[PDB]
Design a protein around this nucleic acid. Structure first.
Ligand SMILES: [Mg+2]
Ligand SMILES: [Mg+2]
Ligand SMILES: [Mg+2]
Ligand SMILES: [Mg+2]
Ligand SMILES: [Mg+2]
Ligand SMILES: [Mg+2]
Ligand SMILES: [Mg+2]
Ligand SMILES: [Mg+2]
Ligand SMILES: [Mg+2]
Ligand SMILES: [Mg+2]
Ligand SMILES: [Mg+2]
Ligand SMILES: [Mg+2]
Ligand SMILES: [Mg+2]
Ligand SMILES: [Mg+2]
Ligand SMILES: [Mg+2]
Ligand SMILES: [Mg+2]
Ligand SMILES: [Mg+2]
Lengths: 41, 176, 117, 202, 26, 152, 97, 45, 211, 29
RNA sequence: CCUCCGCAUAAGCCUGCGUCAGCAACUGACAAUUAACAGCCCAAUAUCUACAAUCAACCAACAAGUCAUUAUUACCCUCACUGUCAACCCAACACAGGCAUGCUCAUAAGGAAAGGUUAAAAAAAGUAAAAGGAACUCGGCAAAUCUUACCCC
RNA sequence: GCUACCUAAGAACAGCUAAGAGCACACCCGUCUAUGUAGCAAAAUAGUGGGAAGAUUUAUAGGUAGAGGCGACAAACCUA
RNA sequence: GCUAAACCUAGCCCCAAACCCCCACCUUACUACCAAACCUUAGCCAAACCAUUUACAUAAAGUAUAGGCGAUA
């Protein structure tokens, strides 16, 4: 793979920091947390 | 007698046996052929003694008293089997000029690869040897694809190894 | 169904285990009624020499000198064994000096090897 | 020993080495600099002088050389401390174990200077290849390591299964055109009147 | 081992911030 | 001899002779109970029982009266980290019966403990490791963890 | 969590390497050397694409016609399959006609 | 009912996929040549 | 197990043969296991001349002012846990005896000035010299815990202590380092500890009875 | 007077199998 | 208390519950099955061989059957080799499956259905039942008893 | 090496009544029912059954191979 | 604070240059030894089905030509 993504931890953490006060699995798992952060926004 | 299969009773259970050196090949060329024949059976009986002890060592769960003198008997037995062959291989050059003791021919089996065919002894000549004539020593035309594919496998293997040597040899001038 | 194991004399039915043996060389032949006739001359007799009065122990003491290894060739053998008889019989039919021209009449033939080991 | 094996202090057949290098370890190889055979100049027994690290400037003597990693282990020096002898309720006793030193980390020492130098394998009419220092044109010898095995060469008395030197040199060889099969069969005293019959070879 | 410097430099400075949220200095 | 090509025998030819024997031998201890005349050897695979009869009448001058051989299957059920089998080799076993009513027992090679006791002062090193077994200086229970180095 | 906990070993880079310091020399060998050579007789690579640029179907068709006679047999069969694939892709498939 | 289609025999295993039968036809010598080009440990039964 | 001997026996039962392997290199030692002749506290003139050939400059009448300074400056390596400096001032036989029990606890040893000028009692003798020196000093000692509550002794009051301090030199770069510390049997018992101790009784199985 | 002991190792293997689907119902309708 | 198992051979498998060591046969080291049984046979060339078997004798068959030499020539050595283990194979398993033959045809051999409890429902396997007796149900299916008669194909 | 058929040379079939005969074992098959349904099992188990001196069943080796084989036609069977 | 996480070098790819390689073993391979090879590729696919047909240095040139004169060659 010529160039792959190294910055992906910091893209997860822009969406997970807005979800830190949620309930259940929507604060930890990014795929559920991105749909709730959008809906919260 | 059977006591020649073990060493002296003053040597059972010592864990160090003072032994001499193994014979090197230069000392054995100065001995004659009746005098190397008897040195074989002295070295044969000293080998058979050590092979019992190495088995009784494993059986008694114990380490050997000295396993380094079985290195000195194998390396002196083959040194005797080298000097007999060096006179057999030289006497054949003077008498017949052949470089090998067993006859043989370069042949090419069914798979197309070139092999050395070591000859065997028979009582009937080869054209009425029923089993020998089934063993066929030529390659038909359908083999030439696999000869080219085997050739390109070794050419890939060699082009992999020679290229990997230069890739390690420029790393040497990066650390040093 | 197991192929990486060696195909050995233990591994077939009854009639496979009779034919295939170990590497043990044949000693005679079989005849009618499965009677084995052991041939006395196919069995190898060891010519063992007598080792009394023999002053060559199996090791070498470490007080020995070191030499260099010069192996025996067909020139060194000739320069020792057959060359000096030539100079004693040139300065005065090669079968006189030691040529054995053809060897279908020998017991111990050097090509092909008649003899054991 | 596998390819890309990792040499260390314990020799590669040992009990401690089998634990460290089992036949499934695949670690990154160390990159040594390729010194040829004639370019190595430190042997078991040379009095060498450390430069880098602890024992700075102190001269010691080489007791082992692991040439497969360009390694010289200087006697008593460049040491750390470890314990030996385990029972489950013991406290400890130190032994000063030695750590190895690279060949760029040690220098040879003249007999008439006690001082560091380098080595260039100069050519003399007295010796075919020998250590001559770079600061003084002096033959440095190759010192005596004890022996490769246990020998103690000059002090060696032989047991009952060793040939004397008078018998391992006794040239009884008579160069002749006879086989050992043929030479024994006149000396072992056998008659073989039967003649061999021609077999084929194919 | 993905190559590159900049994400490893960001992550090194964002672990130092976590070292101060766990071990803040006097 | 093994791994050599034997000459062929035709009717009325000479006698076959080994001069320098290839196959070496080892005499083992019986692991089950045998009679007092039965010696047990470890033959190699390429040796017959007529060959073993001549090996001991010839090289060792032994009155052998009967030989019985069997081939022992060495095990092929033990594996590595690559899950490749490791073959313990086959070996042939002899059973020599000694003539004249001779009797053989296997000797006690390595007699269990010989001199007086086990070990001391092996090298300077073992006396460096044995005299702290005399001088461990174990703790007093009335001290309770306090180090016994300081004179206070 | 694939991000490295230590920062990687440093990249030293020799800007005055012999390759970099003399990069570009004789790129203008034609226009001020009386046109005895072209600048494409400096390019060093595979014999089929010296002084020649093309897409992957033009490249494999040209590599086959120039060097296919001495190509390895399992490597040639991949080339004829690749030309037969890139023919079908470039001539039959796509958004634009 | 099913599953034990394999009923082992050595006179059947050797007569069908043995080295002698693999060489007995030119269609099956290219079997053996395909096994050495892959690098197989065992080219026949 | 319990001994090095039982491992050689549990190997012989289990069948793990460990063969002795030769090495040219051995373990290079620079002390001894113990005292040479344990001087018993309440005629060694050749040994002083067995020092001067391997040392070439050795005056005893200046020595226990130097040997006292190894003593108190190897002991300040305990207050700070400088394990680097203690190896140059104390020997490898003595080093585990004065650092193993003090691990994970803070010592507060301190030297207030002596009572008598320290002197030698006996001197003895690859070759190891040994100088048994008597110091009669006054030291202060407080050992703490991991948690740093006081576990031994006051930190202020200096007590008077009698020491027999054996020294050692390897006879080229070697120096004199403390080798051991012979506690005599007629000596008084030390300071009693802070906590109180239960010494446990014999653990009876159901088939033993306590008499 | 503190040291190391004898040696140790490990062991592991894994395999799978395959199947089908059959003997269902609810015909023509 | 079970026993429809068992013990051998064959085929298959290939050291796979022997010694020492390390729910509550695996690894390392050592050891072993020994030929008389069973495999592994045959010097040529001619010419030989109508009449089964079945207790083979009567009686009866049709489907017409497993069993053999002689002549002249050549021949002198002799007991080698190989299988011999196990709680085992084929079914991905330490699988309620499959698997030829000889004997034992109830054992002289081989084994253990219950980890401990409690004594619900539903469910599975069984045994008993008042009075009735196919009223059940598509159908006497199942179980319980032993039987008639008549069709279609 | 399953199976469909064939070839060579083998094997097996108690007891009872009296011949592709009847009762009935071993053996071969798989009628009906229940359990099972990621099961003991990728077709089993328990009972109940059909045949069991024959167009029988069966071990061993050989044969026929996919535009084909083989088939007491079920468009069956030819390694789930 | 468990499980884990981290890693950098085994090796590889592409090119250039150069044309590369004791014993037993076709019988049941790994078994010491007895009376004869040559012979058109088809098809997918494309033609929107399919039935003739459908590719297997530079420049002249996608030119002349070929073609259910069409896909295309
Ligand atoms: Mg046998
Ligand atoms: Mg079958
Ligand atoms: Mg299954
Ligand atoms: Mg019983
Ligand atoms: Mg139970
Ligand atoms: Mg229960
Ligand atoms: Mg209920
Ligand atoms: Mg009722
Ligand atoms: Mg009704
Ligand atoms: Mg109703
Ligand atoms: Mg019913
Ligand atoms: Mg009937
Ligand atoms: Mg049905
Ligand atoms: Mg019936
Ligand atoms: Mg129909
Ligand atoms: Mg139909
Ligand atoms: Mg189309």
């Amino acid at each position: 793979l010529r160039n792959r993504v190294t910055d992906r931890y910091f893209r997860i953490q822009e969406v997970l920091k807005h979800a830190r006060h949620f309930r259940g699995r929507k604060n930890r798992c990014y795929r559920l947390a991105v749909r709730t952060v959008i809906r919260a926004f | 007698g059977l006591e020649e299969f073990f060493d002296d009773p003053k040597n059972w259970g010592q864990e160090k046996v003072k032994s001499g050196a193994a014979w090197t090949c230069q000392q054995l060329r100065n001995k004659s052929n009746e005098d190397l024949h008897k040195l074989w059976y002295v070295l044969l009986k000293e080998r058979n003694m050590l092979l019992t002890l190495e088995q009784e060592a494993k059986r008694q769960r114990l380490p050997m008293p000295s396993p380094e003198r079985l290195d000195k008997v194998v390396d002196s037995m083959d040194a005797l089997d080298k000097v007999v062959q060096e006179r057999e291989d030289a006497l054949r050059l003077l008498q017949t000029g052949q470089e090998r003791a067993r006859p043989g021919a370069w042949r090419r089996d069914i798979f197309g690869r070139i092999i050395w065919h070591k000859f065997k002894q028979w009582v009937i000549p080869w054209h009425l040897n029923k089993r020998y004539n089934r063993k066929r020593f030529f390659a038909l035309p359908y083999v030439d694809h696999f000869l080219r594919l085997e050739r390109e496998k070794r050419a890939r293997i060699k082009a992999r190894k020679e290229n990997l040597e230069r890739k390690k040899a420029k790393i040497l001038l990066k650390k040093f | 169904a197991d192929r990486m194991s060696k195909w050995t004399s233990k591994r077939g039915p009854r009639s496979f285990r009779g034919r295939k043996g170990r590497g043990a060389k044949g000693i005679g032949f079989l005849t009618s009624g499965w009677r084995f006739v052991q041939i006395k001359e196919m069995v190898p007799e060891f010519v063992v020499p007598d080792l009394t009065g023999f002053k060559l122990k199996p090791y070498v003491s470490y007080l020995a000198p070191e030499s260099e290894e010069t192996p025996l060739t067909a020139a060194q053998l000739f320069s020792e064994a057959v060359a000096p008889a030539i100079e004693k019989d040139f300065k005065d039919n090669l079968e006189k000096y030691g040529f054995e021209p053809t060897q279908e009449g020998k017991l111990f033939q050097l090509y092909p090897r008649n003899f054991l080991r | 020993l596998p390819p890309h094996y990792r040499y260390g202090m314990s020799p590669p057949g040992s009990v401690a080495d089998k634990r460290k290098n089992p036949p499934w370890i695949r670690r990154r190889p160390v990159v040594v600099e390729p010194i040829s055979d004639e370019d190595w100049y430190l042997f078991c027994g040379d009095t060498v002088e450390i430069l880098e690290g602890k024992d700075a400037g102190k001269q010691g003597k080489v007791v082992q050389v692991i040439r497969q990693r360009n390694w010289v282990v200087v006697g008593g020096l460049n040491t750390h401390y470890r314990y030996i002898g385990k029972t489950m309720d013991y406290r400890g006793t130190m032994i000063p174990s030695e750590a190895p030193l690279l060949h760029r980390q040690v220098k040879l020492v003249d007999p008439m200077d006690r001082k560091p130098t380098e080595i260039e394998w100069r050519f003399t009419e007295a010796g075919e290849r020998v250590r001559v220092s770079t600061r003084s044109g002096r033959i440095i010898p190759k010192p005596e390591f004890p022996r490769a095995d246990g020998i103690v060469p000059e002090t060696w008395i032989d047991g009952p299964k060793d040939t004397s030197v008078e018998d391992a040199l006794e040239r009884t060889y008579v160069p002749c055109l006879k086989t050992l099969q043929e030479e024994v069969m006149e000396a072992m005293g056998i008659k073989e009147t039967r003649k061999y019959k021609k077999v084929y070879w194919y | 081992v993905k190559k590159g410097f900049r994400a490893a430099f960001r992550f090194q400075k964002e672990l130092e911030r976590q070292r101060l949220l766990r071990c803040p200095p006097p | 001899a093994r791994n050599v090509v034997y000459p062929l025998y035709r009717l009325g030819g000479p006698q076959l002779r080994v001069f320098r024997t290839n196959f070496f031998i080892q005499l083992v201890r019986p692991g089950v109970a045998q009679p007092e005349d039965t010696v047990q050897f470890r033959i190699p695979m390429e040796m017959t029982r007529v060959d073993l009869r001549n090996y001991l009448e010839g090289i060792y001058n032994v009155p052998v009266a009967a030989v019985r051989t069997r081939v022992q299957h060495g095990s092929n059920k033990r594996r590595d980290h690559r899950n490749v089998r490791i073959k313990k080799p086959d070996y042939k076993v002899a059973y020599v019966q000694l003539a004249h009513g001779q009797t053989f027992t296997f000797p006690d090679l390595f007699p269990e403990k010989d001199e007086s006791p086990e070990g001391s002062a092996a090298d300077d090193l073992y006396s460096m490791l044995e005299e702290e077994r005399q001088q461990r200086q174990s703790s007093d229970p009335r001290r309770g963890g306090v180090p016994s180095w300081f004179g206070l | 969590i694939g991000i490295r906990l230590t920062l990687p070993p440093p990249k030293v880079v020799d800007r005055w390497n012999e390759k970099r310091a003399m990069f570009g020399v004789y790129d203008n060998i034609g226009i001020l050397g009386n046109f005895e050579k072209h600048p494409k007789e400096l390019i060093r690579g595979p014999i089929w694409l010296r002084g020649w640029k093309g897409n992957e179907l033009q490249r494999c068709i040209r590599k086959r016609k120039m060097v296919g006679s001495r190509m390895f047999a399992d490597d040639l069969h991949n080339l004829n399959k690749r030309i037969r694939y890139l023919y079908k892709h470039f001539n039959r498939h796509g958004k634009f006609r | 009912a099913r599953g034990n289609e394999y009923q082992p025999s050595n006179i059947k295993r050797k007569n069908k996929h043995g080295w002698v039968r693999r060489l007995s036809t030119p269609a099956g010598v290219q079997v053996i040549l395909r096994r050495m080009l892959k690098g197989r440990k065992s080219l026949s039964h | 197990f319990k001994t090095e001997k039982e491992f050689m026996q549990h190997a012989r039962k289990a069948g793990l043969v460990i063969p002795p392997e030769k090495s040219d290199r051995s373990i290079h030692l620079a002390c001894t296991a113990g005292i040479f002749d344990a001087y018993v506290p309440p005629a060694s003139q050749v040994s002083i001349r067995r020092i001067k050939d391997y040392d070439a400059n050795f005056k005893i009448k200046d020595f226990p002012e130097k040997a006292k300074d190894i003593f108190i400056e190897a002991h300040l390596c305990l207050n700070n846990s400088d394990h680097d400096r203690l190896h140059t001032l104390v020997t490898e036989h003595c080093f585990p005896d004065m650092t193993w029990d003090i691990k994970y606890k803070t010592v507060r040893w301190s030297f207030v000035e002596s009572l008598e000028p320290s002197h030698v009692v006996q001197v003895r003798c690859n070759v190891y010299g040994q100088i048994t020196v008597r110091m009669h000093t006054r030291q202060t000692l407080a050992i703490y815990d991991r948690f740093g509550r006081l576990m031994y002794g006051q930190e202020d009051v200096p007590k008077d202590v009698l020491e027999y301090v054996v020294f050692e030199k390897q006879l080229p770069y070697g120096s004199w380092r403390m080798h051991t510390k012979i506690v005599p049997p007629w000596a008084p018992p030390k300071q009693p500890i802070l906590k109180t101790v239960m010494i446990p009784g014999p653990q009876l199985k159901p088939e033993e009875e306590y008499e | 007077x503190x040291x190391x002991x004898x040696x140790x190792x490990x062991x592991x293997x894994x395999x799978x199998x395959x199947x089908x689907x059959x003997x269902x119902x609810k015909k023509x309708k």
